[PDB]
Amino acid sequence: NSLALSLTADQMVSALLDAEPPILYSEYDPTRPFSEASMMGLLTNLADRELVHMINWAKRVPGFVDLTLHDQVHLLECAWLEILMIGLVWRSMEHPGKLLFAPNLLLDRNQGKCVEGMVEIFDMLLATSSRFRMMNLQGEEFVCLKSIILLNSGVYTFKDHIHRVLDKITDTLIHLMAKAGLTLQQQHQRLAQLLLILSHIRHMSNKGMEHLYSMKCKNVVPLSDLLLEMLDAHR
């Protein structure tokens, strides 16, 4: 019996805001990366460190630690790249045409060319970022969506608990939009717009996972064992 369900909407928002992981930095070399190896080097190093924070963020999402360890593993295995990607898109919002992988690693699509297949993922990421900007996505909305991804993306490859918590987060999203003054129609229209973007985020993760496994077989860069295991879980 979960404490998550007894939280108020404002408490759910505060739990999620306070759980937020930090914005990590890339290595501080002042070369704009322009090769497959240097690009993939910096990104997999960054992902590896973000994954450690993501794991401890997930344990602070209300309802997550009420699952068995095996269900926690499965959800994180399924969702990790989506979660990395929506974070990227969120912090790239205020930088049109750019992807802020880290405050000292701002890439544009021209650099996506150096890695095989990344310009297509870069283009998708930028389009999602722009969509988020045009919707004036709020940080409280962002944290609800990221938690939705965590609980949802592996839920059907399993139950009632996760769905009750997902319902709790829907309540919280509506609550945020009503607190912001939106009419009833604007609320349900906006809820739909945001959730439909999660379909695109899933598509980008699926495409990125392919290219990551491809790059793993090309042995372009040593991947951490943690990153390898998260990738292998999708194989």
Binding site: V52, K59, L76, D225, L226, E229
Partner: peptide, 10 residues
């Protein structure tokens, strides 16, 4: 013996 198993236990 996944690393994720270990890390989720902190």
């Amino acid at each position: 013996h996944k690393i994720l198993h270990r890390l989720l236990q902190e």
